[PDB]
Symmetry: C2
Subunit: 361 residues, 2 copies
């Protein structure tokens, strides 16, 4: 990296305004012959909590939030994209408008940041950016691939799945994207499931004793008595009986097999806990469920709590092991022994590189 | 002028998922020291819910000052009881809220904090039944009729009705009390995640649940149909939460003669879009009205006709959901009258706290 990279290269700011927090990235890049970004490098990152949608939108609270997120950035005289995801999608457009009206005003009140767009993106666009960001980092975009790379993003309020699929006129145009990048033509199936992110899904199982460690105090006064296969079946009812994940996804994946799966989001944080044993930043769903069942679900809560003081989400590890299995295996139909790569959480790889690439197509 | 110079007074705060409600009640007591002549002498309602604020001294001070500072009466005992909004957080995160709140009360002299805690859904249901029945004057003597109460919240819903003590049901779902010389045994149940905010977050991309052409968040269009929306919501009620399996056998054996409901349903039934007489509805009518007055309407047209109702966009979903809960979940006949307490009365479960602590 150069000293003062934005005096030597193009730079752009992209803000991921997710359900659990907002993440500013500033990227330097160069461009090739088509003015498409290459050599994308993150030169600044700042993550804040809580999520944008969780604040009361008024001039004071928006100024405080945006100052916290942006003020200390090393460079401000650059284009900014503020793209909110599933947290804002939980609100009707009428309620979201207050937020963007205050946000727009704040940007127009200052003279450095160059706001390009501030909006809530659909889960389908978020999926598209998920796939581009991961494939950029894998360096699979430059050339036509021998194998199919699928991406899953596990968020707080939505989950996305995205994989290559030729154009299919029987499938909604909203769930398909054709792009041309680096002179290659790519057709993807995209899908997002709102309500199936970890925070929203969890709020339907907090009184399920099979979903918590033994003796964990459930909110309505019963005790945990964890059993991951049992908890997973409860979560599968939400996946399939309610959202119809399997009916929508499995027929398409059967016909458009994915050779390598990469996942980003909460699953990376779970799989990185010392309660689990994984190698090479990959897991299988069978191993995740069995480890969660044995090391959390059937263990005593007060012991676990004192033993893992740094795992903030420890109380949900039995649930979350069961939930990722329910989603991937019973929902998407992925084999429980199939390798799932998870991107290390220290990489802070979200979908925002996707925006850098996609705005110039 | 100041009733608390001549009568006992206490303050009870309902800290719900969507806001907090301060009530100050004056009362006398009978010869068992049970409250009688309960009168509300002050109310203040604020939003948003306590569990939604960031828990630090600055934020907690602003919230509690807004809730309490302008009350005409202080120097009285305060019970702060939170419900399903705080239940959605682990104890470790809840503790930060209560440590800050505790500090705020210790740092002032006008309010006497007695207890600040999250109550279970079962306790909330008990207080639901006592509050409503106190207001109906059905507690003073043995009733010909079984009165059941439903509380429709943002994050949980409760149901509670009389049921003789049963060794085969969890002790946590049964309450025995002795009040005004009578012995009353209730079944209580709360369903966390089935309140209207939490439920709705599983159905925002269901076209059947929104008016025609309503823009769903993931880019598809509404195409409302209340019976179809109700079927979707029923799979959450019964395939996920097993409401039918848990409640229907018990109501079959313990029929309720009169149902009373509080919470969001009162707001929906009282709205400009729905038409009910005598503060009562039937589920059959509720579903039909939602279907024809919202679901099958064109969104931009209807939105422009009814600008002053923030929940208009959810009315197709809400009418479908209450039917799914009451009919497909609890087993209530679609033609059975459901009384709803008018939203103007601000009747929540807090009178139940006034009564219960003397029992
Ligand atoms: Mg995200
Ligand atoms: Mg309530």
């Amino acid at each position: 990296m150069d000293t003062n990279p934005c005096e030597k290269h193009s730079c752009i700011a992209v803000i991921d305004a997710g359900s659990t927090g907002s993440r500013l990235h500033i990227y330097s890049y160069d461009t090739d012959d088509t003015n498409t970004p290459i050599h994308i490098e993150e030169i600044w990152n700042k993550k804040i909590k809580p999520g944008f949608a969780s604040i009361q939108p008024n001039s004071v609270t928006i100024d405080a939030y945006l100052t916290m997120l942006l003020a200390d950035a090393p460079i401000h005289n650059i284009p900014v994209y503020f793209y909110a995801t599933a947290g804002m999608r939980l609100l009707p457009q009428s309620q979201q408008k207050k937020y963007y009206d205050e946000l727009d005003y704040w940007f127009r009140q200052q003279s450095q940041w160059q706001l390009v767009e501030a909006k809530t993106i659909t889960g389908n666009d978020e999926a598209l950016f998920d796939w581009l960001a991961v494939n950029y980092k894998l360096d699979t975009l430059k050339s036509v691939q021998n194998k199919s790379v699928g991406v899953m993003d596990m968020g707080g309020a939505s989950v996305q799945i995205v994989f290559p699929m030729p154009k299919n006129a029987e499938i909604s145009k909203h769930n398909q994207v054709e792009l041309n990048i680096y002179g290659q033509n790519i057709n993807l199936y995209v899908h997002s499931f709102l309500g199936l992110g970890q925070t929203e899904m969890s709020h339907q199982f907090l009184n399920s004793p099979s979903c918590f460690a033994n003796d964990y105090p459930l909110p309505d006064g019963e005790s945990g008595q964890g059993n991951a296969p049992s908890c997973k079946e409860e979560v599968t009812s939400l996946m399939n009986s309610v959202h119809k994940v399997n009916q929508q996804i499995q027929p398409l994946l059967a016909l458009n097999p994915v050779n390598e799966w990469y996942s980003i989001g909460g699953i990376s944080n779970l799989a990185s806990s010392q309660l689990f044993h994984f190698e090479n930043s990959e897991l299988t769903n069978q191993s995740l469920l069995q480890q969660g069942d044995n090391q959390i679900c059937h263990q005593q809560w007060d012991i676990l709590n004192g033993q893992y003081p740094d795992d903030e989400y420890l109380y949900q590890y039995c649930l979350l092991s069961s939930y990722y299995y329910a989603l991937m295996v019973d929902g998407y139909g992925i084999n429980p022994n199939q390798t799932i790569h998870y991107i290390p959480p220290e990489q802070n790889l979200d979908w925002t590189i996707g925006v850098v690439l996609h705005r110039a197509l």
